[PDB]
């Protein structure tokens, strides 16, 4: 049997050209009155997956 | 394909048992009691291969001290007089002299007693 792809990751990341992963941000759903606007505008900007985290999830989302 | 190992084990154990000759009883017949004693024997061997030198040095020194007291001098003052007089004679040699040629040892003692 071949690998199973973690679909919860396949719905939550995206491959770049260098193989790295794009990701949405947290603290961006429902509770904004507690957050300044700098946080909100800086969190609507995506970011990239960490080194040690990609080390942990690459086997899951190997090809995707 | 299958592998049995009839001879490897037996040869490997005969080696240890040949190493274990002279050992009381089980320690020359049984591989476990032997091996447990072969390793300890090798430890003791490695350690005695150092303590050997200490022991003979100690022995030689006692002999030299005796032969010097019989001339009216001690090991320490003797050897200090020798180091003064630039006389590089090993203690093994000096003990052999004290045993066999007391006259040569006496000459060395005169040298040292002059150096002092």
């Amino acid at each position: 049997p071949k690998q199973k792809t973690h679909r919860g990751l396949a719905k939550r990341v995206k491959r770049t050209g260098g193989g790295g992963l794009k990701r949405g941000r947290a603290f961006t759903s429902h509770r904004f009155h507690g957050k300044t606007k700098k946080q909100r505008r800086q969190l609507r900007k995506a970011s990239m997956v960490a080194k040690g985290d990609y080390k942990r999830i690459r086997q899951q989302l190997a090809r995707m | 394909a299958r592998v049995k190992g009839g001879t490897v084990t037996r040869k490997r154990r005969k080696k240890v048992l040949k190493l274990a000759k002279g050992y009381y009883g089980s320690k020359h017949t049984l591989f476990k009691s032997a091996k447990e004693q072969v390793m300890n024997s090798y430890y003791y061997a490695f350690r005695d291969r150092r303590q050997k030198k200490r022991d003979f040095r100690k022995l030689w020194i006692a002999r030299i001290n005796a032969a010097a007291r019989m001339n009216g001098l001690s090991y320490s003052k003797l050897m200090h007089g020798l180091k003064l007089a630039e006389i590089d004679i090993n203690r093994k040699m000096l003990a052999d002299l004290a045993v066999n040629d007391a006259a040569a040892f006496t000459a060395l003692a005169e040298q040292a007693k002059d150096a002092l």
């Binding site: 973690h6 919860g8 939550r12 941000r25 985290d53 086997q59 | -």
Partner: protein, 146 residues
Amino acid sequence: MKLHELKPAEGSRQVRNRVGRGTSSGNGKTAGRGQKGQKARSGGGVRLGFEGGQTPLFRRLPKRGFTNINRKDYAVVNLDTLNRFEDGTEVTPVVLKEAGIVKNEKAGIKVLADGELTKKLTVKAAKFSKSAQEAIEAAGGSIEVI
């Protein structure tokens, strides 16, 4: 070669690492699993992205987007290829496939302009980019659309 003189190249084939076959191998008496623990067990360890009950990275992040079932993904030809073909000729998906440039005409050929073109060409495809149109028509070719 002679069968009684066979040799591989150096570094091509490596000796296996057998495990639990004495201490002086280094991989003996624990198999590189270390002392006791869930990792030191047969079928032990944990799932592949498991942080010990800590909220995993996938779960603490949001899902984004969707997939358009009617998506048109085109096969790309970047204008540095086409310096191959003799000037004045007719480029087609059939030509590109026969050459082996494009093996997967996914939705249609799209032509894009990264490299420098140096020929007249009667190129035709599903879609062109505007810079490619400019470069082709400037060299003296002619754009069409299948």
